[PDB]
Amino acid sequence: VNSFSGYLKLTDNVYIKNADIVEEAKKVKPTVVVNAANVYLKHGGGVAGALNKATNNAMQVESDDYIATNGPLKVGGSCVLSGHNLAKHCLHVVGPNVNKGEDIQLLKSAYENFNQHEVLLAPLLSAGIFGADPIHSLRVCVDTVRTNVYLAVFDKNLYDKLVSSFL
Numbered sequence: 324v325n326s327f328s329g330y331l332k333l334t335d336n337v338y339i340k341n342a343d344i345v346e347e348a349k350k351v352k353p354t355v356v357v358n359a360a361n362v363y364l365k366h367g368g369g370v371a372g373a374l375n376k377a378t379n380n381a382m383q384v385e386s387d388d389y390i391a392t393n394g395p396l397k398v399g400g401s402c403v404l405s406g407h408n409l410a411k412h413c414l415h416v417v418g419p420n421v422n423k424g425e426d427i428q429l430l431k432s433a434y435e436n437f438n439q440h441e442v443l444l445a446p447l448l449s450a451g452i453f454g455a456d457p458i459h460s461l462r463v464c465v466d467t468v469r470t471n472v473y474l475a476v477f478d479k480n481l482y483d484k485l486v487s488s489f490l
C-alpha cells in the first residue's frame with residue numbers, strides 16, 4: 324500500500340491522474356519524482372521549469388554543479404539528484420526532444436531508467452514542449468516500465484484523451 328490517491332489503474336503497474344506534478348510531489352513526498360530533463364540540466368520550462376521553480380532554484384544550483392563535474396547527460400539517459408522539498412530523490416530523465424530532431428526510438432531507452440526504481444511519480448516523457456505524441460509516450464511507458472509508475476498529466480483535456488484512447 325502507498326499514499327498515491329485518485330489514480331486510474333491502466334495496467335498491473337501503471338497508474339494515471341490529472342494532476343500538477345509539482346502539487347502531487349508536495350503532497351506525497353514520493354521516494355522518486357521524475358524530471359523531464361534535457362542533457363544540460365537547464366530547467367527552463369515545461370515540467371522541469373515548474374519543478375525547479377518549486378525548489379526555489381535549488382534544483383538548478385545542484386544541477387549546475389553536476390554538469391560542471393560530469394558533463395552533459397545522453398539523450399535517453401538519466402541521473403539521480405536530490406528531490407529537495409519535493410521528494411527524496413529526483414530522477415532526471417532525458418527523453419528525445421522532437422523539436423530538436425532527436426530519434427523517437429530513444430524514448431524507450433529513456434523509460435528504461437524508471438526500472439531502476441521500485442516506485443516513481445513521473446510525467447509522460449517527451450510530451451509537452453518536447454514535441455512527441457503523448458499517446459505514443461504512454462504506450463511506450465506501459466510497454467517498457469515494469470516498476471510501479473504514477474503518471475501525472477497536467478492538462479485535463481489530454482488526460483481524458485489518454486484514458487479514452489488507451490488500449
Ligand SMILES: O=C(O)C[C@@H]1CN(c2ncnc3[nH]ccc23)CCO1
Pocket residue numbers: 343344345368369370373446447450451452475476477478479481
Ligand atoms: O502533463 C501535461 O499535461 C503535459 C506536459 C506538462 N508540461 C508542464 N509544463 C509546465 N509546467 C508544468 N507543470 C506540470 C506539468 C507542466 C507542459 C506540457 O507537457
